[PDB]
Amino acid sequence: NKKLRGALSSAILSEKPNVKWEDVAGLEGAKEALKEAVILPVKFPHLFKGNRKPTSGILLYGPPGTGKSYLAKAVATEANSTFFSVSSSDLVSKWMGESEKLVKQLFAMARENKPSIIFIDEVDALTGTRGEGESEASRRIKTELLVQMNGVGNDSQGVLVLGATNIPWQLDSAIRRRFERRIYIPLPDLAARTTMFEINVGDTPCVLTKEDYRTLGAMTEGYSGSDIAVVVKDALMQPIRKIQSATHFKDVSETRKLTPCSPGDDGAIEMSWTDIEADELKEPDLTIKDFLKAIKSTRPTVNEDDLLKQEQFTRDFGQEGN
Amino acid sequence: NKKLRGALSSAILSEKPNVKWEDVAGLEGAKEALKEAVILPVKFPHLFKGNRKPTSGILLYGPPGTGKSYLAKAVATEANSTFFSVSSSDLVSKWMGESEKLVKQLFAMARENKPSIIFIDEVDALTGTRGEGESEASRRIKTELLVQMNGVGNDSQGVLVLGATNIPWQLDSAIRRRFERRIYIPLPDLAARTTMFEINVGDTPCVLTKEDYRTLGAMTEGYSGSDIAVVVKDALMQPIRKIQSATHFKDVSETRKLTPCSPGDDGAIEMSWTDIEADELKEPDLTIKDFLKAIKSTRPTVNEDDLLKQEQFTRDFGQEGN
Amino acid sequence: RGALSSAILSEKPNVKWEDVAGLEGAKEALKEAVILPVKFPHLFKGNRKPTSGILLYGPPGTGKSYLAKAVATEANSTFFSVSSSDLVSKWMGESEKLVKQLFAMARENKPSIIFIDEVDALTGTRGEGESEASRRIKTELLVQMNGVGNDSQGVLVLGATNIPWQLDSAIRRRFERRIYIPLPDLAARTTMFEINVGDTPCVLTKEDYRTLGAMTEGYSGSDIAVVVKDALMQPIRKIQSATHFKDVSETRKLTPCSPGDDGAIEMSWTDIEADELKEPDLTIKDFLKAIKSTRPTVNEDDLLKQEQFTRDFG
Amino acid sequence: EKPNVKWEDVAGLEGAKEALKEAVILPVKFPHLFKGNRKPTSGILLYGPPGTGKSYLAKAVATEANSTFFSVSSSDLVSKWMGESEKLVKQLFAMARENKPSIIFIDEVDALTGTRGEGESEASRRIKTELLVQMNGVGNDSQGVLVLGATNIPWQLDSAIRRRFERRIYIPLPDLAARTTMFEINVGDTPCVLTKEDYRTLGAMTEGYSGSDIAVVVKDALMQPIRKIQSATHFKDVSETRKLTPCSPGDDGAIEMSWTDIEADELKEPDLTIKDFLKAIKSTRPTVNEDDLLKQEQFTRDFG
């Protein structure tokens, strides 16, 4: 009975990934819903008294790579509560009955450590609409999930069941009834893309301006957040390729701060960068040409059919996440 | 935990197949990307700090028999890291909920032995777009890979997930999002074919010249690397066939080195090669006629519609890897 | 053994018969089946036997577990709210011993009532499922549901099921009373809004509740509850949109108003202490915004499958 | 598993009878013949229209060979699990070679596979290829084990399976003497007044039927007297200690009663006549089609 809690104690993370609300570019409706879900019942407990109850479940859905796990990291950072990060490897067991006793002990620990947050990434693996799947695991896990979510003699009060999935239409109808907040996280718009570029570039010394970031956001038409992250990564790795595949360096302005340039200048010394020791390194600064080359190299991942499926799911049972 | 580690201890290869970067001909973009993402963070760790992060996943795709596993062998040779080589037999198990703990312990061992490189050959078998596959094991192993690659409470820093598949359009969209660099490995051009001929012939005693190698590389149009390897193997096997059909031997020049010729010559000792003992044989030299015979004997492997599908996937969601 | 100390609840959740909006036939059937053998014990003897099996079904989220909570509140009897988690064990034979001792304790604690939520978790139709944990448990439940002569006085089995066509036909025939819980009509919608608002101050009238129930076309009970929750949370969002606060009348009860007014004290909202914030009142516009936000959680395929099931086994 | 049907109980099919007779009797009775290049037949396909005594002839070979028999069917070698419908065939051939010499009877080989055209490709390919490897293979050395296959549709088989089957014997429609002999063995030891010319006229009348059809019309003509005993009134006491016989209502002493008050071992059962068989043949219709005979003609024409 204690080995179950010892196995489930590895699902409570204590690393606290530093993702703040200013790190998330856009998604103001989802951020406001998560704020009124977690920040308010701990900061202002004198408002949720009587017939006013907080939210008891939020389903984040959308295209792959839009920021659902990033909002989960931000909630785990700024929640100041117990965060349960479970998956299909922490609930399914080899024996018989342990696959439901683990879920019962997980919800018992979540109710014992209230206020607590249960984050189940990829809820479509556990809830497979119980029509054709494996009888034992599917039926028992889904029914125990329903009973531990509301049930009769459980009274789940103060816990939050976050869920992030890419396939929202393959959920069970009872699970979709349990998740009382269907929040659609879409692909980012122009202002979100420009703020995401401003966040991902950071304190790197570059000649880019706000008009340059605006033209970059207008260029990335249909990109996702991971695609913006990898074009920022490619544009940041571009000065390393510039300092690798070039010769005829030149000391600019400091203990020989030499920089690659055109062959033939005021001191175009023909040597290699491997002989250059550290801290006499003046790499070329970022321009718009490196980001244009990163845009030309890296291609968008999300197609234009899954967007139609997510749009049909929003018009069927979904809200908007701005 | 310890049983799964004892089962997965036979996955780290300690053989180190001696394939260097000069053994691979062509594929300059794939060479440069693998070179930075393997060599640079373990050789110069002071550069990747702050906003600059290395590549966390590289996917290699193309027609069958182009050099994906050869590039993986070169990475495993020149990586100086704990090279993890898994497939669909080390992860899938018989019991219930034991295939997910295998992948979790594999990624835990990869994080415990960082820097490490995970090479999953034929990723198309594990990931099948989770549309109509076998529900429990398929969807759970896909969601477990998706959680263990980036996830929330994992923070995979230092590991690398290499992929090598022949049919990349059957990959899941979230898995294609995880593989942040799709590198297309095409059929080789004339210089790569000439370099592969010079590498595969190598230190063999032959009278072949640069013009002969150029004519061979111009002749093998549409061939692949395995086809070049087997025509070099047939051209090397042909002097043993000439030794088999070697009536009227002729001892030319030291310590009685026998050499076949036309029937009836100077010193035409008419015998067979069975009674001739070892350590005194002299094989005939390689000409361009044996290689032309091998080219006329062995046909190419890949056809011209699979190349169209690979180019379609490249222009849709990939980059050109030279 | 002693592991069944969690199947019975001692909380008694305060859900009375007036709280259950609508469902008059199911309410009166459960009322007679839980009251009349305790009210008039001479009425049930021999031929005129009471109901020993009650089954509830319909769309998901219509009031099945709510009716079970109402029975557990206004029954005055031992409630056995147990599911498939406390019936299956790692060993062999204990999965039958659990049901045997469960029915033994339920017969010893007469009058009792056993409520099995999601009974399809025990009825996998034994196609190619787990033998020792499916078929033997199903036959044990079939021979322990043979209390038409054994448990004439005492226990009563219940059932709540969202998907009732995937149910074993033997236990379906053993459940003699199968009541279909439908979507609520307009009067049930209006009294459900009246119950869910409750003692919260508002300006909503009976005509406002009637047009709210007319706007909710095809909504369910949980959808009505989360619409009421969103309408309750909307004045907190209006306070969070802090601009030009204004004091009303005791001991500085502030209230935000339109930008530009008489006494528009432009300040923040977190600088003020508690118990002096006169919150705005519930209009109909926040309710209409909650209607436009919240979507119905049920589809048309489940409704036609429920219609097929009730026309096949009404 | 041993039946009790000898060679003489099968009517007609002379070529199939002599072929099976030599192929299963010549090694087991004369071991001094098959030496050197002389090897027995290791496969026989018995096709044709259904109901024409294929399993009856298989039981005749199972009796007269005095060897071990295996009489599995198409549904026995088809499972729902993945890769479990081939280990059954492997264990079948293993237990056949364990008790050599043996006879293997596989029924509905057209329904065992699905000629890998449109059905389940994985299961079809694995079943067919495991059957072929268990038939000849490399290290399977099938000597003395005879694969006796029977089917109703031969043209839906595979080229490799019809190559593995050596002698493709056709079972045709029965003839006049075969029909009369089938009537004579189907009527049994019942008290009858039928003659050889009556059997000849019956067999001339039932041209186009099958063996199962002849069996069910003999069963109908045998059940019709005990049907007319029960479904009749106004019985008649003829002649010796209350011998009762049904007749028309109203006769020379037509006693109207039921069969409940008739004493045991005194009720006169009426003998069956020609009109019962005429009623049976006028009631029963032929079952076979006409294009299947053209398909059998084509199959014999290119695999005679």
Binding site: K94, W95, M96, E134, S135, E136, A137 | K94, W95, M96, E134, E136, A137 | K90, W91, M92, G93, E128, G129, E130, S131, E132, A133 | K80, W81, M82, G83, E120, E122, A123
Partner: peptide, 20 residues
Amino acid sequence: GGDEIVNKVLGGXXXXXXXX
């Protein structure tokens, strides 16, 4: 008896509980 371990089979899933 002893413990009962759940296994997995393939169709074309289920739970063939092969205990010890």
